[PDB]
From a paper:
[name]γ is a ligand-activated transcription factor which forms a heterodimer with the retinoid X receptor (RXR) and binds to specific promoter response elements (PPREs) on the DNA, acting as a gene expression regulator. Further studies also showed that partial distortion of the β-4 strand makes [name]γ more susceptible to phosphorylation and that [name]γ ligands serve to stabilize this β-strand, thus making this region of the ligand binding domain (LBD) less available for energetically plausible binding with a kinase, regardless of the degree of ligand agonism or antagonism.
The crystal structures of [name]γ-LBD in complex with 1 and 3 were determined at 2.13 Å and 2.20 Å, respectively, each comprising two [name]γ-LBD monomers in the asymmetric unit. The omit map of compound 1, calculated from the refined model, clearly showed the electron density around the ligand, occupying the canonical partial agonist hydrophobic binding region between helix 3 (H3) and the β-sheets of [name]γ-LBD. Surprisingly, compound 1 showed two distinct binding modes within the two monomers; however, its position inside molecule B seems to be the most effective for the inhibition of Ser245 phosphorylation. The ligand also interacted with Cys285, Ile281, Met348, Leu 255, and Gly284 through hydrophobic contacts. Our data suggest that compound 1 prevents Ser245 phosphorylation by acting mainly on [name]γ stabilization and exerting a very weak CDK5 inhibitory effect.
Author numbering:
A (entry chain A): 203 to 259, 277 to 476
B (entry chain B): 207 to 238, 245 to 258, 278 to 453, 468 to 473
C-alpha cells in the first residue's frame, strides 16, 4: 500500500488532470478516438491536396492559420499554468519568464496528441491535414511541420495518456533553468513536487513500462530542438516574407529566446 | 535486480577511474596549486593558439571516452557502425559534461590541472573566440550545483553514450535496452549516494536538454588539419 506522502502526490496528480481537462477542449483521448475511427460521428474531413484544402475551407494562408490556433493554445496553456499549485504565488516576472520559455515546448507536446505518422488533426478535430500535403508546400513552408511529426511519432510511442501528460506539461512550465529567472528556489521546489507526482503516476499507470519516467524526461531535449529549430525558420520567413504579420503575443515570446 | 545494478555501477566507476586521468574528485581539490592565466602577459608565461590547444585536448579526450565506452557491458557487441555513430554523436556531450568537473564560475582547469585559465580572460578574446566558452561556463554552473561525484558521473556518461536517437543508427533496440539498464543503475546510485537530494535523477536527465543545446550552438559557431 501507499503512505501519506504518496497520498499527497496522487491528489496533486488528480488536481492537475482535472485542470487539464478543463483547460484543453481537445484531449488526447478525444484525438486518438477521432484518429482511429472510434468514429462515425467524429470522422474528420481530410485535407491532402489543393481541392481538398479548398473544400475543407496557400502556404502563407495555412501558416497564418497555424499561428492563430497557436496563439489560442497559448491562452489555454496560460489558463492551465494558473492552476499549478504555487505558480501564481511566484514572483510575477518569473511567471512571465516560465510562460515565455515553456509555452512552445508544451504546444509541441500537445500537438503530438493530435498527430499520427500521416497527418495532424485541425480545427478541434473536424479536419485532418496530411503530413504529405504539408511537406509539399513551397519552400520553406514545407519544412515547417516535418520535425514535429518526427518527434510526435517518437513521443507517441511512449503511449502516454492525458493523466500522464497533465503532470508532464506542468513539469515543463516549472523549469528553474530558464534564463533570467529572479527567484529560482521556489520554482525548483514546485517542480520537485511535480516530478515526484509524475514519477508515481507513471509507476501506477504504466507499471510494466520500464524507466518510462526517464524516457519521458529525455524527450524534453527533443522539444528544445524543435523550438530552437522553429525560431530559426521563423527568422528566415520574416526576412523573405516582409508582408507576413506575426502575432505580438508570439512576437514577445520569440524575442530574445 | 539490485545486485546487478550495483555491480554495473561499480564496474563503470572502476573503468572511469582507469580511463580518465583527471577525475572530478581531483579537479575539485585543485580548485581549492596551478599556474593561473588571467592576462595576455600571463598566457605568454603559461586566441587561435588557444582554440587549437583545446582541439588537441579534445582529440585526447575522444580516445579516453572511446576506451571507456568499450567497458560498458554490451557496447562492443553492438553493430560496429552503431558503435561508431554513438561515439561520433556522443563525444561532444561527454566532453562538456566532464569539462564542468574542471570548471568553476571563475575559470577552468587545464593541462591535467597544471593550469587554470579564467572565465574573464577567455571572455576577452576577440570575436568569435571570446564567446566560445561563456555558454560552457553557464552550463557548468547549473550542472555542478547538482554536486555529482565521480561514481555518479561514470553512470551518467554511459547513459549519454547509449542514446538510441543518434541519426543513422541501424539497430536501436539493444542500445535502448542497455541504456534502460544504465538508467536503472544511475537512479539507484543517486538515491543511495544522495538520499537527501530529492528527484536528483530527474534533474540530471533534464540537464541533457541544456547539454545538447550547448553542443549544437558550439557546432554552428565552429596533415595537421587531417588529425582534427
Ligand atoms: O501542421 C500543422 O501545424 C499547425 C499547428 C501547429 C502547432 C499547433 C497547432 O494547433 C497547429 C497546423 C494547423 C492547425 C490548424 C489550422 Br486551421 C492550420 C494549421 C497544421 O496543420
Ligand atoms: O593543454 C591545453 O592547451 C590549451 C591551451 C591553453 C592555454 C594556452 C594554449 O596555447 C593552449 C588548453 C585549453 C584551451 C582552452 C580551454 Br577552454 C581549455 C584548455 C589546454 O588544456
Amino acid at each position: 500500500q501507499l503512505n501519506p506522502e504518496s497520498a499527497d502526490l496522487r491528489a496533486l496528480a488528480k488536481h492537475l488532470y482535472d485542470s487539464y481537462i478543463k483547460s484543453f477542449p481537445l484531449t488526447k483521448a478525444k484525438a486518438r478516438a477521432i484518429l482511429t475511427g472510434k468514429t462515425t460521428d467524429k470522422s474528420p474531413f481530410v485535407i491532402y491536396d489543393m481541392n481538398s484544402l479548398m473544400m475543407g475551407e496557400v502556404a502563407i494562408r495555412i501558416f497564418q492559420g497555424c499561428q492563430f490556433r497557436s496563439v489560442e493554445a497559448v491562452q489555454e496553456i496560460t489558463e492551465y499554468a494558473k492552476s499549478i499549485p504555487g505558480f501564481v504565488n511566484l514572483d510575477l516576472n518569473d511567471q512571465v519568464t516560465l510562460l515565455k520559455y515553456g509555452v512552445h515546448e508544451i504546444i509541441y507536446t500537445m500537438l503530438a496528441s493530435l498527430m499520427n505518422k500521416d497527418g495532424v488533426l485541425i480545427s478541434e478535430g473536424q479536419g485532418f491535414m496530411t503530413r504529405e500535403f504539408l511537406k509539399s508546400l513551397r519552400k520553406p513552408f514545407g519544412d515547417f511541420m516535418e520535425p514535429k511529426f518526427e518527434f510526435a511519432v517518437k513521443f507517441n510511442a511512449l503511449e502516454l495518456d492525458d493523466s500522464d501528460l497533465a503532470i508532464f506539461i506542468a513539469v515543463i512550465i516549472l523549469s528553474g533553468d530558464r534564463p533570467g529567472l529572479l527567484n529560482v528556489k521556489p520554482i525548483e521546489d514546485i517542480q520537485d513536487n511535480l516530478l515526484q507526482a509524475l514519477e508515481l503516476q507513471l509507476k501506477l499507470n504504466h507499471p510494466e513500462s520500464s524507466q518510462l519516467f526517464a524516457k519521458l524526461l529525455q524527450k524534453m531535449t527533443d522539444l528544445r530542438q524543435i523550438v530552437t529549430e522553429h525560431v530559426q525558420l521563423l527568422q528566415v520567413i520574416k526576412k523573405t516574407e516582409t508582408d507576413m504579420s506575426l502575432h505580438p503575443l508570439l512576437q514577445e515570446i520569440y524575442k530574445d529566446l
